[PDB]
Amino acid sequence: APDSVDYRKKGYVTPVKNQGQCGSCWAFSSVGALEGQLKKKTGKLLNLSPQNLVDCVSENDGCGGGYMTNAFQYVQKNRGIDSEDAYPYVGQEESCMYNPTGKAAKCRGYREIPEGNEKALKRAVARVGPVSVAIDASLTSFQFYSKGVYYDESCNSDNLNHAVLAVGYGIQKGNKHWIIKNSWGENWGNKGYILMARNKNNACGIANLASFPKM
Numbered sequence: 001a002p003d004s005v006d007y008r009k010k011g012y013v014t015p016v017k018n019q020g021q022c023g024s025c026w027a028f029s030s031v032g033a034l035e036g037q038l039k040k041k042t043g044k045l046l047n048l049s050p051q052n053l054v055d056c057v058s059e060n061d062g063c064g065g066g067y068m069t070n071a072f073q074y075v076q077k078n079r080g081i082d083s084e085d086a087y088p089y090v091g092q093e094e095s096c097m098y099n100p101t102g103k104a105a106k107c108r109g110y111r112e113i114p115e116g117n118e119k120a121l122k123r124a125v126a127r128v129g130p131v132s133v134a135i136d137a138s139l140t141s142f143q144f145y146s147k148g149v150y151y152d153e154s155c156n157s158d159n160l161n162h163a164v165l166a167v168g169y170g171i172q173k174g175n176k177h178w179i180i181k182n183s184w185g186e187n188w189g190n191k192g193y194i195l196m197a198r199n200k201n202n203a204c205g206i207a208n209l210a211s212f213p214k215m
């Protein structure tokens with residue numbers, strides 16, 4: 001263990017989920033960050049509801065994509081977000097079914113990492129916890145990733161098409177990286193995660209759309 005951190009070993013990360021056919025990566029990413037702050041603030045965490053966000057964040061497009069900051073704003077204005085148990089994931093948008101009795105967390109706003117600043121993202125991951133981020137995950141090599149530290153210069157930092165969650169950082173075999181939680185199931189990548197090159201010119205745009213909720 002070098003100059004690094006891995007929140008999976010600290011109870012700040014819930015099990016890896018599978019968004020299914022639905023383009024809800026942004027909802028899983030948002031919930032992931034919210035869950036981390038729930039643990040930081042209260043000492044306990046709980047699977048929050050991605051469906052709640054898919055069905056109720058009108059500024060977003062449901063299974064057609066969306067932004068994490070919009071989700072954080074919703075939780076704030078809504079005065080809460082339901083737990084997974086109270087508002088189960090069905091993988092398809094349905095009418096907003098938010099129920100305050102199932103509230104499991106709330107937030108008072110959010111902060112965005114300065115665009116392209118990986119040092120700032122590193123500081124946020126160390127001082128805040130899991131951070132919602134967006135990347136270019138369109139490359140076939142990204143999708144079939146299995147191990148090691150992913151680095152492909154063909155990645156387009158101007159084409160963020162998938163939202164994920166930075167749950168740590170460190171170094172493998174001399175290769176600095178970010179520990180990334182995806183939402184394509186535990187069967188994807190390495191147990192649901194991917195190690196992405198860190199301090200390599202903001203590879204794949206990892207620090208271009210990073211944010212976290214405030215509690």
Ligand SMILES: *C(#N)C1=NC(N2[C][C][N][C][C]2)=NC([N][C]2[C][C][C][C][C]2)=N1
Pocket residue numbers: 019022023024025026063064065066067068134135160161162163209
């Ligand atoms: C996720 N999952 C996710 N899915 C989509 N789409 C739209 C195009 N067709 C597939 C489903 N879109 C987005 N948008 C985000 C990309 C990363 C930056 C914030 C928006 N996410």
